[PDB]
Amino acid sequence: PKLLYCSNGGHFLRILPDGTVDGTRDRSDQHIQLQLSAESVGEVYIKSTETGQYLAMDTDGLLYGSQTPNEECLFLERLEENHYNTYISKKHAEKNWFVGLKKNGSCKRGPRTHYGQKAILFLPLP
């Protein structure tokens, strides 16, 4: 299990029990501990080890945590430069929607994310 730290604003990716996704600059926040399991080479689930909810992107680009693992919960994982990682919404991959956080640690919807943004960069951390 691990933490995922975003360069935009320096927030650990966090899935809150009400299925709200954001960042928190503040660790030991119970809901930043994530479990990444590989369904196939390069495709991951991101699961909260607290609420057991799965990261997911809806059709509008808005991150949310989900109680049942499905099509919306898969993310293609690409190892960066840099040592960071990017996560692309498998279901919405051919549109290039990434997981991203704004500097307030608030969700950055897929449509606005783009390679080169710091919003989309996450460090895997034990």
User: Residue 103's domain is classified under what CATH number?
Assistant: 2.80.10.50
- Provide the number of structural domains found in the chain: 1
CB 62 within 8 A of CB 107: yes
In this structure, how many other beta carbons lie within 10 angstroms of the beta carbon of residue 107?
20
CA dist 76 and 33 (Å) reads: 20
CA dist 100 and 15 (Å) reads: 13
CA dist 69 and 51 (Å) reads: 13
Q: How was this structure determined?
A: X-ray
CB 65 within 8 A of CB 56: yes
CA dist 34 and 13 (Å) reads: 9
The single residue listed with the structure tokens 């933490």 is 3
Domain residues for 11? Answer: 1-126
Return phi, psi of residue 6, to 5°.
-85, 135
* Structure tokens, 100: 């991203």
Q: Is 70 annotated as a binding residue?
A: no
40 three-state secondary structure: strand
State how far Cα 85 lies from the chain centre: 10
Question: Torsion over CA of 77, 80, 85 and 90, rounded to 10 degrees?
Answer: -30
